[PDB]
Design a binder for this molecule. Structure first.
Ligand SMILES: *[C@@H]1O[C@H](CO)[C@@H](O)[C@H](O)[C@H]1NC(C)=O
Ligand SMILES: Cn1c(=O)c2[nH]cnc2n(C)c1=O
Length: 351
């Protein structure tokens, strides 16, 4: 069950190197549900580090070598055995080729070696899909993993505003942010970084990308402080669209930026326990959430995404309960946050 590539008809909406951006689509003619998924993969923030990414991560900067098809997996699968939640939906995979956490609005020019158009790519995909059946939708779920999950938080309200302005007020826009809820915490060991702390890298990135953030969050933090809006616990309270948050309590990318690697002594034990407690605290007032006590980099487009449970409930079940809640529910919970304090204290964590 493959998704087919469509390069954007507006060829001025581009990947980093000026090649056209695009999307992979599998239609389901009997369905009014649409799932648009944002791929992740870090980011780059100056000429030197973007040049290095162009040599060895070129598919994340260019469409020139993309394949004609991709197979949908996990939440993008059309088989009910693999995807109990939304197997009959129209499926869209949007490749990440802008290196800007889906925030950019800047074209290649005599002054710019690369284009950073992530925010405009999402806009243009939505516009072109309206002529291919999206005009008839009841629900548009904007989902994403890692940098794509942060991209959901930055873009879900702009998609909702775009559809209203275009004359489609009956489409309900919602977000699903997987593995994109980060903390601007103190590192376990400091000055290490690479290239550098995410706060400083993002501050530089916004200027290099001409990056944009949601309007209410922008108005709170004001000029020069837009980097704050890349942090889930700060941007989420400003959003109007419903958003479901999936986040490992001990996410591997969070630990990497914190300079933690892997016989654990007291200082590191306390650091790890405090990180899980802080993450749990930030989710206390997030009513739709799934946060297992695991050390993982695994994401929701993996084939075995159904296996993990919190308090005896899987993620596909929690998402179904969220759908019902948007029509508490007896035996159908939507707020699922582990309370145990060490990775793999939940026996269902990925192996
Ligand atoms: C293509 O997209 C750009 C960026 O959003 C926009 O300014 C331009 O008007 C579009 N071109 C056409 C022909 O729609
Ligand atoms: C690793 N990482 C982060 O640490 C971070 N912090 C804020 N956004 C972030 N993003 C998008 C990210 O990829």
């Amino acid at each position: 069950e493959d998704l087919r590539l469509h390069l954007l008809l507006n060829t001025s909406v581009t990947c980093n190197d000026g090649s056209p951006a695009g999307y992979y689509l599998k239609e389901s003619r009997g369905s009014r549900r649409w799932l648009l998924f944002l791929e992740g993969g870090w980011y780059c923030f100056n000429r030197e580090n973007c040049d290095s990414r162009y040599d060895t991560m070129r598919r994340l900067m260019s469409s020139r070598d993309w394949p004609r098809t991709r197979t949908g997996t996990g939440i993008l699968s059309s088989q009910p055995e693999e995807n109990p939640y939304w197997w009959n939906a129209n499926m869209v995979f949007i490749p990440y080729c802008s290196s800007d956490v889906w925030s950019g609005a800047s074209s290649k020019s005599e002054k710019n070696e690369y284009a950073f158009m992530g925010a405009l790519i999402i806009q243009e995909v939505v516009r072109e899909l309206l002529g291919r059946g999206l005009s008839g939708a009841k629900v548009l779920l904007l989902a994403g993993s890692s940098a794509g999950g942060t991209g959901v938080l930055l873009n879900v309200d702009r998609v909702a505003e775009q559809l209203e302005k275009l004359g489609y007020p009956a489409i309900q826009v919602r977000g699903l942010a997987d593995s994109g809820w980060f903390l601007d915490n103190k590192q376990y060991r400091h000055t290490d970084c690479v290239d550098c702390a995410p706060t400083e890298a993002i501050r530089r990135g916004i200027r290099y990308w001409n990056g944009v953030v949601p309007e209410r969050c922008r108005r709170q933090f004001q000029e020069g402080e837009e980097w704050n809006c890349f942090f889930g616990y700060k941007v989420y309270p400003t959003l109007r669209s419903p958003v479901f948050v999936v986040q490992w309590l001990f996410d591997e990318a969070q630990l990497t930026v914190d300079n933690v690697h892997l016989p654990v002594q007291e200082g590191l034990r306390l650091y790890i326990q405090n990180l899980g407690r802080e993450l749990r605290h930030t989710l206390k007032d997030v009513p739709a959430s799934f946060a297992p006590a695991c050390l993982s980099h695994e994401i929701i487009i993996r084939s075995h995404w159904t296996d993990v449970q919190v308090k005896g409930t899987s993620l596909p079940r929690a998402l179904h309960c969220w759908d019902r809640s948007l029509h508490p529910l007896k035996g159908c919970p939507v707020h699922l946050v582990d309370s145990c304090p060490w990775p793999h204290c939940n026996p269902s964590c990925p192996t």
